[PDB]
């Protein structure tokens, strides 16, 4: 099938987004950064290692559900088009593409992400593995370009890995409302959500003893150093995984070991870290089964299927427009 890539992000979209977030984030109290910047080449390779850590259950848990329920997803949604809010690189991507193809229904694939070079590689890869599927990759962001996702056919939107968990309730509901807005009656959404559980298990999942997640978090300081001429003493910042009991969410912090004076060159900004000051780099909200259905209902979608893994660690929702 023919490959297409439509690019809606300017060449300096990423850099200009990084200046904004760093300028604003390092002047908040407490200092905070979007989890958007962990993923340069190094961080992406670190995340790949994280998914194979025994402590990080979500990847395997979601995969377990998908290995069992992918056929039912295909037959219940009846989609001919797979829209992935992601890079299209996971084996989970293929599991759903196989399930739709097995029904003789796989007609189009739409990967949607911000890295045009990632989408181009995904599209070439799906093109050799799935004869007869048109691949329409869309380079855009959630805030502006959900409308640029092609229309027509019966579309199954996919958003896995409890990545919606990286949005706080306010921004999370806006995203779901906007996503439901571009969905057509008959379209469906498959959404993965990590579930609330034993706190010690959750903290361990975000601070493996080998420190891969620690390096992954500290990697954000190198990215700021390299891209905006900052002088973060990366080794003087400790990764700290916190369980927020009141908000029921995991929080990734970076703790300054001693007073730090950090100058971000490209921004003409100097910020100060008190000794023991912590900066928030990510939130990872954990969900309750009932609450996910209410959130989809609040945005205008109707959950028709809910699945957990065998241990009840992770949940998958199939909601219809
Ligand atoms: N996308 C996503 N969703 C949930 C958790 C995570 C995550 C972050 C940082 C380290 N390990 C896992 N990423």
Residue numbers in the entry: 1 to 321
Give verbatim lines from the article.
EgtD, an S-adenosylmethionine-dependent methyltransferase (AdoMet), catalyzes the trimethylation of L-Histidine to initiate EGT biosynthesis and this reaction has been shown to be essential for EGT production in mycobacteria and for long-term infection of murine macrophages by M. tb. Synthesis of EGT by Mycobacterium tuberculosis (M. tb) is critical for maintaining bioenergetic homeostasis and protecting the bacterium from alkylating agents, oxidative stress, and anti-tubercular drugs. Multiple X-ray crystal structures of Mycolicibacterium smegmatis EgtD show that EgtD possesses a Histidine binding domain and a Rossmann-fold domain, which affords ordered substrate binding of L-Histidine and AdoMet, respectively. In this work, library screening and structure-guided strategies identified multiple classes of M. tb EgtD inhibitors that bind in various regions of the enzyme active site.
The two rings of Imatinib modeled within the L-Histidine binding pocket are well-resolved. The remainder of Imatinib extends to the AdoMet binding site resulting in a lack of difference density representing those three heterocycles. In addition, the nitrogen atom of the pyridine ring forms a hydrogen bond with the ordered water molecule analogous to the imidazole-water interaction observed in the L-Histidine derivative structures. The pyrimidine ring forms only three van der Waals interactions and three hydrogen bonded interactions with two ordered water molecules and the side chain of Thr163. Superimposing the Imatinib complex with the M. smegmatis EgtD-L-Histidine complex illustrates distinct modes of binding site engagement. Where L-Histidine interacts with EgtD primarily through polar interactions, Imatinib interacts through almost exclusively van der Waals interactions.
